[PDB]
Amino acid sequence: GFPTELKPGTNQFLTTDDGVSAPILPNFHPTPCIHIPGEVRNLLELCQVETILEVNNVPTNATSLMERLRFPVSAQAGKGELCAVFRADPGRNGPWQSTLLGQLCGYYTQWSGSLEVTFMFTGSFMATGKMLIAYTPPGGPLPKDRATAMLGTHVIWDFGLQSSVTLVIPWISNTHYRAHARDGVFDYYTTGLVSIWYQTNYVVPIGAPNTAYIIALAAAQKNFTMKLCKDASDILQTG
Amino acid sequence: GFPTELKPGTNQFLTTDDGVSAPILPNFHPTPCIHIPGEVRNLLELCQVETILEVNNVPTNATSLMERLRFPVSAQAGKGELCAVFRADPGRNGPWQSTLLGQLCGYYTQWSGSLEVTFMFTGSFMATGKMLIAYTPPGGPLPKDRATAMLGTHVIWDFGLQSSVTLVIPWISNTHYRAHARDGVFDYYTTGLVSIWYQTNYVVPIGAPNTAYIIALAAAQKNFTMKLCKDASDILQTG
Amino acid sequence: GFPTELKPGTNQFLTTDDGVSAPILPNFHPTPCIHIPGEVRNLLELCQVETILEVNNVPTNATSLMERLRFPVSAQAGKGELCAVFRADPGRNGPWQSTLLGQLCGYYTQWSGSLEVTFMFTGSFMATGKMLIAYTPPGGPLPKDRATAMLGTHVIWDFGLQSSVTLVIPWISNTHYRAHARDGVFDYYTTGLVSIWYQTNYVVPIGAPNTAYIIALAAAQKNFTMKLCKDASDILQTG
Amino acid sequence: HSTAETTLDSFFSRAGLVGEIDLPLKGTTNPNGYANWDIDITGYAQMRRKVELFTYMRFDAEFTFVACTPTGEVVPQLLQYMFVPPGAPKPDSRESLAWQTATNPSVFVKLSDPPAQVSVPFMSPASAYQWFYDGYPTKDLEYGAMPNNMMGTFSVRTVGTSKSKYPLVVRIYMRMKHVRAWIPRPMRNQNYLFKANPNYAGNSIKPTGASRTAITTL
Fold it and tell me: Which domain of life is it from (chains A, B, C) (predicted)?
């Protein structure tokens, strides 16, 4: 015959070896693939979709779960008051878990790209005012007050003019490794922060509700990426 | 030698692997194939052949088995009366088992195509009358009477004019899977129905028999197909 | 290395597999083949050679074995008398065993082609007369008498004119299989027959012997063939 | 849209089980630690009716041998599989010289070695194997006997001068390849009674398929 020497790894079964195997049904002609709308090809398509960010992830009472989707603003809040705050940690617990992006980050170990949060005011049409939305890069501590946050990368939002506004998070990178307990977790540290302060108070004419809610929607830019498939889940197929 | 690593599946025997093996008699020159009439190349050739459909599959009495091949029409039957009925279920029990098509469907799991039944009046030449032949697609329940069947896809057949008539069954598809008892059977549901009513009565002059028979012949169109070889049989080679 | 899966038949020893094996003496340069007269290339060369057919295969008495090679004709035989007879069965027992053709048929299972027997009169030069040589194809029973054989494919041989004559057997085919005892033998049935009758009597002048012999020589035409090597023999290498 | 599966070759592929040899230690069955199996393709029950759809056929067979002890165990025992072509003499004993006749292909393999596998050609001296023969070979018992349909015999035995130390079971599979068929014919609708002829039970003559009450009820 033809001279050969078998090399180590012969007869082994690698769960990730993508070789070919013998077709059980050689003659079988599987029913032809026809056209179906919205085919997905690469998960990052999904990551660029706006999902509702449960910033108000505080109520747990079963019947108030719908409340996590929206946080509110009211007349009672005085100028300068801090409305709300959260981090730019897509994969870690908290707000991002609600977004689709967050859930997909979970099947991966590393990632990086620019994010993008959009706020939607759902209050009465007659209401007006200004909100200051500031981003404090990783490391920078949550600004003491409105004015100090006013010096950072911020955006004055007048929902009297535009009902929507989108903020871009320049960058977030879950790359810095951590071996705490005895379980190694490739964690953030890049917990960028997004604060939101009442630049002015909530103003309304008689006849309009003195409270309104807002909805956070997030997605990642086209420069987003992920690495290291890592299946992990609390939800599994029950016996 | 030449470096190699054996992959899983090495040394296995797949009853469907169509590889090559060593020729026991290398020098042997097998007697040359000469020309023989009617060579068959693909079974679907057979499926397009007209076979007698035992619509009248009721007598079992050994000496009356030849009766299954033909059903009859007579003077006694009044206008509108339902002559006969059956389904468009090539592979399932009943009438189709007699046709060659039926028997071939048995060696397969799935199939689909347009069928075609032809009726032949074998009565006296002097007889005349009309028969209404209607097809009720899958789902539609056997028409109550002649008139309601008259509204469906039907054909008035005057065997006074033409001794033959061929009906086409637009479509039949054994594709809907069923796991009843604990034995999974890819069944029809598409039991299309073919009803036949005495549009007019059987008319004859003195001297001619007051009964005549008819023969059903079926085959499938050229658009027929089958999938999944499945050997199954009640008849086997005895010990 | 290079991915491979071993298929059934791996490690087996087929006594007829004509693969290659490692040369025990790689450097050895075997003494060159020089030219030698009469090289044989295909056995069928031998089959076309005339060998003496022991038609007279009757004496067994050790010192009369040379007698099997020739049969005789004499004055005593009257007109019409049957001189001799035998079949066209190259491979079966009897006369053909003496011919080389016969012996070669033994190392094979099947065969077919036209044969050819040549008769040689070795009597005195002064003798004359006629012999009728007839062939009765397979199935046709040995002709009753000279006259009935005279109607079949025959040849009148006047050894007064020509001392030799060659008869051609159009065809013989050992193809019809037989499983008699419990030992399956691909036998003839095509036992074509060759009869030889004294058309006229043996005529001679005073001074010449009243008996003469004849020699049968057979071979096969160029259209001869054999199939299925089958080593068989009564003669083997003794311990 | 494709009809590759409805081809002859597709229909007849697959290596089916057509033979099983038993070589017990203590037994009434094959007492001489050897066995002769004349090649019968009807060995796979389902087969007979499938081929009997055609009048003439032609093909090659790929044989694969599976040997183990009754519990399906593997043991260090060597085996000889001998193929005796038709016309060649089968071994009458465990020491018949047939076992050594070069003209009888033989293949050796250890039980440990994966399945043995060889291809056998279209033997028949005729242009095609014919399942039906309406005559006799030149009321009789030779009716429907087309002998020129013999493929040959397979002789199996443990290697060695002495009986094997283990009880053995050989299984023979056969894949049919390169098939050609002629003259199609009615699908057997009655039960088979004999391996030779088409005779059926003249009392138990059953209707091809399921019957019903009236021709107006479904």
Answer: Viruses
